[PDB]
Design goal:
This is part of a larger assembly, with four copies of chain A. The first copy, chain A, has 375 residues and is an alpha/beta fold. The first copy, chain A, is built from 13 helices and 13 strands. Chain A starts with a strand and ends with a strand. The PDB classes it as isomerase.
């Protein structure tokens, strides 16, 4: 089996009527966009990969138009040989970097999973078939607005909730303290994402507070490149500190980060750091350092599917990221990844990534597209 | 100041016929694209700024497309408050990252320089009017093809030349040994760019070899992310070890790189690390660590000017990067930066970047453009 | 995906008429043993896993007897969930340690690769279909005996050979120096394994020497637990220093060593560090340190296949270890991994490990066996 | 000294009716094997050493079989030269390792002690002849069951007791908090063994709770190979962090751990790290670092006796590990180490190890034997 690549289809889509969601105070409303890479083989088998985008003013054409300059060479290559593929992608020169490549890698791993006749978490090595999830929230203007949502999260079954906030200490302090006071004895594990905008002193104060109240983790306290402040936070508190997850992408930077005590864990997204190939590697690396890889799976169903499978394949990962409500990120998807009353989220029934989709709906949803074929 | 941006133009241009410049061996012919950003203010004044792209199969729209999702918010902002603007650019989400944003920062300063009535290097400081340059070479199928090019460089006035090689240890050994045999005694300072392709074992060998012959520096020995190999190279050789210059862009990454001994210098490009605002900063950081910043100024004329002006503002930079022959990179430019018989480039006459473009010519070769006003 | 284990078979086999292979000076001749594990799923699909033993006086039963304690719990487990299996094995008590557990994890992976109709190197990644190999040598009483053997390897197609020596500095010098004299300009890559019996002073002297003469790597210079010596060797020579490969097996110990500058590479055996599951993970860890995992595949066909698949799966690994001559270690097997005329070893055409064993011959050569079932 | 080895006997023995003692949660009950070595000299002197085993399903032959490949070369060698012997043992290839080689080195020292007409502790030093002892507890399904066990230990004369918990943080908290309540004002020193199963996060929390209440030590909080967590615990608490004692066995590893501040003590068993020869050296090493070597002496009378002497020979070691009740581990022994009313354990009266065995009973319980001799 010297499998071959015969066709590729690129899709950039979105929803005009979907809600923009800026997870940062006084910050223009972000427009989300799903960049999709569809691969065909000469035997008919198709594999899917995807990574999203968030921009202001318009929908993102950056990734798709970078993928454009990458994919022509994919023709006649073998998707099952996913390593030399990944390697080959590292060579292709663009300013889209690793995020614009991930889909291709992911989409190939989808093919392997299918021709093997088994889901992806098995090929990497099955550890479990489901996993506890937490809910990533939108940013509300007032504090009281969180309570109705949070209650709806507890009703739904979630066992943990990660707050997206204003990212302005004083504002977040009221949000955080008021939540503690109300849901402190709930059992629900709470997380906090400050998108790296705090000052170091604000980071420490929040981290101290959260630690005393046994909150789960502080994500992105400051700039991912403020190495020392990260080291200081991990050194002076027992609270799990986590990176923003889209800045230090290489296996080396991860290695270096864990080696120098910058992170309590590792935050990585298969759709950004190079696909399954690289994500799967970071799990092992994190294990080496006796730590977990808390996946960043917020995104459209292909973005979450890709991350899920890898997490299921290993033990060193506590949660799967669930953006509640769903709908928004189910755009043109026959497949739907959701959470039960137990608080668990399961692998799809299908093989490969386990994600079938509707190509009429994406065809219409996409404002930009491309095709590359044999002839 | 009531100064405000009234309009912004984006261009992505290229020369269909121009020859591709393949760095390493087996690397497919690359198509070079120039992503210009033109600004206008309400009082007529005009700001220029560009960054470049190199792709396969098609000229690049990836950058200009990033710029598109960024620029709308510029209308109404004051380009003279350049730090505020830079601060503002950091919050613009986009996979185009720091390179897409640099042309803007640059353009702002270009306006600043024109309204000041001064060349940009006077605004940042004022150390020198001219700087020694080195010739940044093509890549020739055979080693012999390098000899006449070098002969041409030396006759032209270059006192330094930086070889772009096959980036394959064993084909670079003959290249380097051959060049040294002949020109080793000429007086010409040689450099080498390996585009981060070597294994740690090969970089050390090559480095040692270079050290023994007094070559000027070894650039991009391995992946810029292999921190320990860089540390090792710097610790066990007196050779100058520079990075690839397009990976560790942030001030923090830089402060850390020098702090831990990864680098002999800092290799940065204003058109990549976030504009003049950022490059100008890294210069002082470099000084603080008692090192030089070596401007990665290979690119089109605007790219050159942005880097040259910062370099002339400070003492701690040895050369300006001159790709040679010039022609390809002077696409649609009423201004030419070139090296004189003594091996110097000079600050272009004029204020700001000191660069003028032929706007007919850019549009003629502009395969993508956007206009924003309001 | 209800997939059960129906039955396990355990074999401990060897050969009376086989040449004992002592790789240390005057240490009694070691008798070899292949400890095999055969898994059966409820659909008749067979899993194949093995690890070897080297002992004196008698053939080893230590490992299979350890396996006995472990395997009963396998019945009614799913071998496709390799990771929860590896986890399960972790918390099972035997002084047999990880080497005793490895074979089961392998077999589980062989089954998985078989139900997917795929060779293992495809499941894990898929980098190459072939990798260069090196002949691991026996130990000859006299130095002269190495010369005919080496020629045979060169005649055969090998491009590298790892000399096993006397592991006594003074005599080893006689070897290395005599060999380099004969085959120095050959282009063949020589390695040396000293089984960690050298004093520190001795190892440094040997390393400086090998460094001068561009030898590939030094293996087990001293006790794998003498960290500082290792650090010192790597700090003070450009020579690839390798561990013995059978002492620091945990993912954390690998990570620590690479983080503290102890090893130039990582030496690990899938049939020792806890199966394919673990080795696979040590490849990644190594890639993150910008280093290779040079596999230990010195053993029977089943051990060869396990390590070969993982090495093929990834990029960061230069060589596969081929003990020469073959026969001895092809005991009871229909599959034959061998180096071709160009020094390459390929992956078996079969899926999973692609290893087929002569089940008649194994029962014959088996001197100890157990069977467990529902 | 013409003193040569004339004969050696190997034994693997056990008891069906003895109660199985599992210290882990859900792990199938562990069966306890005792692997014995009996060296004979030409002049008739007898040598006794042992190391135990714990396995599921069946009794262990792993060690006896390892020893089967090692001991044939013993014939002719001189035990009185224990160092050259231990050096000899280091170079014998077995996956059985130092645990399989340990009892041989112990047997030699016994033959020396007997020829010298002296207690082993007198050959090595002689700090004192009795040491305080603590009781290693079994595992009880229920926390309530610990209470009558403890009350018995306090009546028997134990001044300290090491609790074997469930190794599940949450279940261990109900246990620990409960014992502190009824026994917090006893004067009894409490320790805890979690066999490296806690997450580093839980480890920190336990250790801090333990530091609060002045518990003596926390043993094997996490994998012995997660060096940073050990360093982190030792650096951020004044609680004694000890290792599992069965993983890092070499002198080099011990030297390194203390050098890089991983341990507050060294935990080593003579029957695992390679005999008295090696344990004795580790005491000297630990003294060099002003720390103590807290012996792991849980096992049959022979495993107990070996470790005891070494610890009686030096000053830096606070306790002897008595598993209680004794009966099970006195299997086939004419000698019995036990804790007098005052919480001290004394050295056997004999020479060498001071341990006499009942050979009828060993051959009677030995489910697998071997015999080796000259011509």
């Amino acid at each position: 089996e010297d499998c071959r690549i015969s066709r590729v289809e690129l899709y950039a889509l979105a929803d005009e009527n979907a809600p923009p969601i800026p997870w940062a105070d006084n910050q223009e409303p972000l427009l989300y966009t799903n960049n999709i890479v569809r691969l065909f083989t000469e035997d008919g088998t198709e594999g899917l990969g995807a990574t999203m985008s968030y921009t202001e003013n318009f929908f993102d054409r950056c990734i798709i138009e970078s993928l454009r300059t990458i994919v022509p060479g994919l023709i006649g290559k073998n998707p099952l040989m996913t390593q030399e593929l990944n390697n080959w992608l590292g060579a292709r020169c663009t300013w889209g970097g690793l995020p614009a490549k991930s889909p291709i890698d992911i989409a190939a791993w989808d093919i392997k999973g299918k021709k093997a006749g088994m889901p992806l978490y098995m090929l990497l090595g099955g550890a479990r078939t489901k996993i506890k999830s937490y809910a990533s929230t939108p940013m509300f203007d007032t504090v009281e607005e969180y309570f109705p949502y949070i209650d709806d999260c507890i009703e739904h079954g979630f066992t943990a909730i990660k707050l997206h906030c204003y990212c302005v200490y004083d504002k977040d302090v009221a949000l955080v303290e008021a939540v503690e006071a109300k849901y402190g004895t709930s059992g629900i594990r709470f997380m906090l994402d400050t998108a790296g905008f705090y000052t170091p002193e604000q980071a420490m104060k929040m981290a101290k507070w959260m630690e005393r109240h046994n909150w789960e983790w502080l994500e992105a306290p400051v700039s991912d490149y403020d190495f020392k402040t990260y080291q200081r936070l991990v050194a002076n508190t027992d609270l799990e500190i986590s990176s923003h997850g889209n800045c230090l992408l290489t296996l080396q930077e991860v290695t270096h980060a864990l080696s120098t005590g910058m992170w309590s864990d590792v935050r990585q997204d298969a759709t950004v750091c190079g696909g399954i190939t690289q994500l799967n590697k970071c799990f092992a690396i994190a294990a080496g350092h006796s730590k977990n890889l808390e996946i960043q799976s917020m995104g459209y169903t292909l973005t979450q599917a890709a991350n899920l499978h890898v997490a299921l394949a290993h033990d060193n990962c506590n949660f799967f990221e669930q953006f509640y409500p769903y709908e928004a990120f189910e755009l043109a998807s026959k497949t739907q990844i959701r959470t039960d009353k137990e608080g668990y989220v399961h692998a799809p029934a299908g093989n490969g990534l386990g994600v079938e989709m509707d190509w009429d709906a994406v065809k219409e949803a996409s404002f930009a597209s491309y095709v590359f074929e044999e002839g």
